[PDB]
Ligand binder design. Sequence first.
Ligand SMILES: O=c1ccn([C@H]2C[C@H](O)[C@@H](COP(=O)(O)O)O2)c(=O)[nH]1
Ligand SMILES: O=c1ccn([C@H]2C[C@H](O)[C@@H](COP(=O)(O)O)O2)c(=O)[nH]1
Lengths: 285, 288
Amino acid sequence: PPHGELQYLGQIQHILRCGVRKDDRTGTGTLSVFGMQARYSLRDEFPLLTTKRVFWKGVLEELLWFIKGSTNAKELSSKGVKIWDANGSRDFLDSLGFSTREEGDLGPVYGFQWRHFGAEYRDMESDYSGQGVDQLQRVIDTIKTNPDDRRIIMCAWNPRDLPLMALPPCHALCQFYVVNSELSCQLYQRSGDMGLGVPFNIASYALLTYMIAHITGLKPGDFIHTLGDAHIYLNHIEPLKIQLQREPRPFPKLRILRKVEKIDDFKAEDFQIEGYNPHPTIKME
Amino acid sequence: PPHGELQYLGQIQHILRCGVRKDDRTGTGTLSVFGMQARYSLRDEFPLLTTKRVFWKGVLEELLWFIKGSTNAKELSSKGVKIWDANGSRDFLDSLGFSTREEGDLGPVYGFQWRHFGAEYRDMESDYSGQGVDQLQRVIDTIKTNPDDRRIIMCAWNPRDLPLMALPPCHALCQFYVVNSELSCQLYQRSGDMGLGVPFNIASYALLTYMIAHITGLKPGDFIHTLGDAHIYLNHIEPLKIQLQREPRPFPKLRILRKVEKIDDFKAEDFQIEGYNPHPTIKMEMAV
Ligand SMILES: O=c1ccn([C@H]2C[C@H](O)[C@@H](COP(=O)(O)O)O2)c(=O)[nH]1
Ligand SMILES: O=c1ccn([C@H]2C[C@H](O)[C@@H](COP(=O)(O)O)O2)c(=O)[nH]1
């Protein structure tokens, strides 16, 4: 009765067996399935994949960067995490018509949507204090005062702001749920590169759930990963096949090293991944 | 090939067996599971549930009402479909603090969000032409010009407008997908009353997919139903146990009776459900 990492590997196998050939904007080509769902227990385990090493430092720094409301790729890059740098480049920005935008200015992406949904975006340096909807703090407040609420949603998909963004968000929304003192999170991810993006994305939302569980005095329950276009790039098939034959090691644990009161107060040094024993990195695309 | 409706019935059985007690605002109580997903083929079949009769006229008129951009419960009620009337009443509006709102004015709900996302909501009578994002038409245009696009989303969840709405939307967003000339749709439904709401909601989004497939010259593929809080109200347990004893009948077909060019041009008489053979209606009392 597959659990943990086997859910992810079962998804890869399903796409290899049942996915259909489908081109993408890059003309690379994929095998693709529309609509998948996996459940990862968070109960005394943290779903950082072991069949290939996941970029944990990237996961953690990106999430803290989102939490601070930043839309400046330079602020993430300064932490040694370069994953958004190409989308903030001078050439890239110009290709989108944003010639007067300063380098690094991703537009109203995750950070802005999460803390200031509906505010008027100006640039990455503007003071947005008190503007728009602080969905992250509202989620936290609702969990505290009305844990049964069926509307605990944080939504990054903002149709009005899409044309200003460097890239449209893949993580369109997430929803939280509480029962029996456990906090669960479901992510709606519209588009998933199973080889390169998805392991990172699972660890991101499991981490967010651990953070909010910590702040609200609850235990982490499940992370439910829902995909729209779940795809494997054709040039990832052979590497993933090698990966698929590797035995998972038990998932590590995540420790939070002090009592933290407010979501904005977490720092990277507050977190420790314990007993992570991955098989070596597998290079993909 | 098992009947598609067995997925819905398997979800009910799972919640009865493994759902946990979870209270709601009405103090009715539910059994609840978080995170479920079912896939309903749309290929030469229409998933209108047969183990109890679904209110098809409600499904179809509500959808046409969303398409027109309406936020006026009276405009749906005039078609004989009363499902939003309690939420537009003077009493319900006043309970939310909207004492100066006109009766019927649901606020910036589905219709507004789908056709005018991001516009400033005034009232249900205002002219919003050209204001906000027409997500419904943009979805149609993208399917036509770039069917591989992985961003074909229509989103009703608008955090800025939530406090103005009569009810926050259960159907937070949907996404479309095209491959092999087939159009699929996935619904993210944050909250599902499995007894009373879900059968209706499946028919709504399958109907929307048939409509857009027709407009864009594609065949309907799959409807993927994803749930957040999937729940059975405690007072629905005994009726659902009766329902669970029924064998599904083969699903009907949906016929579209003329060639329609624009989503706004569909009329109720354009649609015919063929070979629907449900078991009788099962009464389930709505929470509050
Ligand atoms: O966090 C992320 C960001 C991007 N992608 C993937 C999916 C696609 O392969 C590509 C995004 O391209 P589009 O879906 O926007 O076309 O990157 C992910 O898996 N996770
Ligand atoms: O289209 C709809 C509208 C509502 N409901 C249900 C789910 C809940 O039982 C209730 C709405 O309550 P909240 O989720 O907002 O608490 O009605 C549905 O299943 N489908």
